[PDB]
Structures are given as structure tokens and as C-alpha cells.
Antibody
């Protein structure tokens, strides 16, 4: 029911501007305070700021007031965060959140912004073929993140996905699933790899 | 800004036993209206934060009564009784007596459980990869405890560290184990020059001949 779908992330060069959007649904969005919080890779949480229903009151982290501008369009049920003069230190996952610190507290799934002079690069993906364990190997991509699911996400128990590794400017990871020997190869197993920054969506059938 | 301090890791905590995660405030969070402006959030691996407890005494909806919090103004304790495997994650304390909202660094809950050896699996490169000029050999160590483990690669019985990348999962939600993968990436030529590929966990050894 209650949803906060975020977008507008990706890669941006140092000094640039970027505008994130948070599309609300499943509640009267016009009657709630909304917030932005970010999480840098491998780090904690930083509250950016918040905005009241009518947009007459907007609070910021003092050190982020120059750079960040929180706005909203109740007619569109949307929250916005406009960033400018962005630097490497602004690389993070950005969350929008409904009415933090109350019964109504709810956070969106987050959108990644990367500040970099490097080139977005699509992953290469390879099957990991021999209960039985299968996987796929995802290599060569930039920036983060990639997501890896199995049978569109329907296959969840037994899935083990390691954290990404950075080397020589590119990321890799691998996801594995353990599955009853009677199920595979008798039944289809697929891994779905998405790299949102390059708009990459691919599927690999895992086969003998 | 009010600064919230907490340790980065809990002491290892046996399942069914009570966990305690502490947090300290640089200014009192008790306001003259009697309310203490402290919040607890849980972030489970690969997920956004979820409110557990707001203003000390209130449970967010769907949060079990196993979670409680107490403390005198400047020094607090999240208690989780009868710790379950699904409680694993990073616990954040936070405040908003004063703007801006600030959060603690987060405390990773460490669950303690029986030692377990890894189930080890080795994967030759796909034929698919070979045309790329690379060949990746993958070793997967599945469902072990504790986290600290070592993987060694040997090609034709000789130890090879070059081209090896290792990475771990977080502690698992259902069994409280870890898994990790090691990938030896070579050129297609190096891989085709040799026969015997071995990885070993530390003594569990899996191998194949090309």
C-alpha cells in the first residue's frame, strides 16, 4: 500500500547538479512531513533535511544548506532533492522518508548517486555451473550498484550474494543458490542482473 | 549538532540470550515535557532502515515486545531479549531534541552460534567467458561460522595469489552463518596451460582437472 519510489540517481561529474525524485502512493502525501537521509558506501546515516506539508518550513543540516534544496509537489505527490556543485563526498544512497520518529515512520528503497569523472560501464555476466549449488559471476561494472536476483526474485531461500569488490576502477560480485538436486537441472533456474546506471537488464539461464 | 556515540559491533550473542546495545548522547535528550527524544532503527542487510522504538517508550508497529530501551538522559541501552537469528543487522540510535537529526555510527549485532565448517564448491570458468580473454575460477564456501576463514588457491599444486578476489556475505537471517566466494581470474591462455585447480578452506579442499 504505502510506497515511496525513488529515482534520479546515477553518475554525475564533480561540480554538477542532480535532482532526485520520490514518488509517494498509498497515503495522503499532502498531510505528512517528508525527509531526506543519505548513506555513503560502508558508512552510517546523515540526515539531509525535511519539509512540511505546505512547504513553508524546510530544515537542513547546516553544512548541507548551500548545496541541497528540498521541494515538493503535492499535486504530483512527489518529493524532490536538488543538489548542485556536487563533489566526491556526495556519493551515497539517498533515502526519502515519511514523518521520521513517529508511528508513520517509513523509508523508501533508496537511489544511488555517484560523483565521478569515470565512465559508466555495463557488467559482463557468466554462469556458475558444477542438493546442488549454482551461481552467476558479475564483472567489470561501474558505478555501483548491481542487483542480482534468481527467477525474478521468486527464488530466495538459499541465495547467498557476497558484497561487491572494487579493483582497478571496476566492481565485481557473485551470487550463488543452493537448490535440491531433484529440482535442478530438472527445472529452470535463472539469474536476473540489473545495473541501473547503464540501464542494463539481463538474464542468464543456468544450464548443464 | 548533538553527537551520538555507539560501538561498531556488539559482543557475540548466543541465540535465545539477551543482547544489549548502548548509545551515549553529548547533550541530554530529556526535554522539560518529560519526553526523551531518542530513537532506535534497525537496518537489515540490503534493506533501508526501519524504526524500532521512538521516544524511548514506544514500539513501532510490528516490532516485537522483545525490544526495549532505557537510560538516564545521556546514556541509553537497547535490550533485545531472546535474540532470534532474524534480529541480525545494524542498530542505529538517533535523536531530535535539536535540529539537525543525528544518528549514531551503528552497531552491528553479532550472533554467536555453533562452529560450522564450510560446504565448499568449485566452479570452472564457463566456456562463455573464454572468448573474452579471461577465465575466472570460483570457490564458494557456504554456511560456516565463525567469519574469519582463509582460502588458498593452487594451480597444478602450486600456490597462486595473483588475480584472486575474496568477498563475504553478512551473517545469515535464518541460520546465523556466513558464506564467502573467492574468484581466481586468469587469462584464457594461463587457464588452458594448466590442468589442476584447487581451493582449500582454513582443512577442506575441493579441486578439478580441466
Amino acid at each position: 500500500e504505502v510506497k515511496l519510489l525513488e529515482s534520479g540517481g546515477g553518475l554525475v561529474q564533480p561540480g554538477g547538479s542532480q535532482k532526485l525524485s520520490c514518488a509517494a502512493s498509498g497515503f495522503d502525501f499532502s498531510g505528512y512531513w517528508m525527509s531526506w537521509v543519505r548513506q555513503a558506501p560502508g558508512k552510517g546515516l546523515e540526515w539531509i533535511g525535511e519539509i512540511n506539508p505546505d512547504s513553508s518550513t524546510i530544515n537542513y543540516t547546516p553544512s548541507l544548506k548551500d548545496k541541497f534544496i528540498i521541494s515538493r509537489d503535492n499535486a504530483k505527490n512527489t518529493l524532490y532533492l536538488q543538489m548542485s556543485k556536487v563533489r566526491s563526498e556526495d556519493t551515497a544512497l539517498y533515502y526519502c522518508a515519511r514523518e521520521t520518529g513517529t508511528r508513520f515512520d517509513y523509508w523508501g528503497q533508496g537511489t544511488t548517486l555517484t560523483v565521478s569523472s569515470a565512465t559508466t560501464t555495463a557488467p559482463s555476466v557468466y554462469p556458475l555451473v558444477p542438493s546442488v549449488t549454482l551461481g552467476c559471476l558479475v564483472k567489470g561494472y561501474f558505478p555501483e550498484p548491481v542487483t542480482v536476483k534468481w527467477n525474478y526474485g521468486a527464488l530466495s531461500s538459499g541465495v547467498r550474494t557476497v558484497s561487491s569488490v572494487l579493483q582497478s576502477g571496476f566492481y565485481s560480485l557473485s551470487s550463488l543458490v543452493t537448490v535440491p538436486s531433484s529440482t535442478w537441472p530438472s527445472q529452470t533456474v535463472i539469474c536476473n542482473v540489473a545495473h541501473p546506471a547503464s540501464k542494463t537488464e539481463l538474464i542468464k539461464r543456468i544450464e548443464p | 549538532d548533538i553527537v551520538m556515540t555507539q560501538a561498531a559491533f556488539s559482543n557475540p550473542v548466543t541465540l535465545g540470550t539477551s543482547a544489549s546495545i548502548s548509545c551515549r548522547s553529548s547533550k541530554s535528550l530529556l526535554y522539560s515535557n518529560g519526553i526523551t527524544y531518542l530513537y532506535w532503527y534497525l537496518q537489515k542487510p540490503g534493506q533501508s532502515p526501519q524504526l524500532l522504538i521512538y521516544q524511548m517508550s514506544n514500539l513501532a508497529s510490528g516490532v516485537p515486545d522483545r525490544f526495549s530501551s532505557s537510560g538516564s538522559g545521556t546514556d541509553f541501552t537497547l535490550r533485545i531479549s531472546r535474540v532470534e537469528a532474524e534480529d541480525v543487522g545494524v542498530y542505529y540510535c538517533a535523536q531530535n531534541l535539536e535540529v539537525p537529526w543525528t544518528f549514531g555510527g551503528g552497531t552491528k549485532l553479532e550472533i554467536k552460534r555453533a562452529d560450522a565448517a564450510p560446504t565448499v564448491s568449485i566452479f570452472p570458468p564457463s566456456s562463455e567467458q573464454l572468448t573474452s580473454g579471461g577465465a575466472s575460477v570460483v570457490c564458494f564456501l557456504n554456511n560456516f561460522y565463525p567469519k574469519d576463514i582463509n582460502v588458498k588457491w593452487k594451480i597444478d599444486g602450486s600456490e597462486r595469489q595473483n588475480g584472486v578476489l575474496n568477498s563475504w556475505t553478512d551473517q545469515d537471517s535464518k541460520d546465523s552463518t556466513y558464506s564467502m566466494s573467492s574468484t581466481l581470474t586468469l587469462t584464457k591462455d594461463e587457464y588452458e596451460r594448466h590442468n589442476s585447480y584447487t581451493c582449500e578452506a582454513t582443512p577442506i579442499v575441493k579441486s578439478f582437472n580441466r
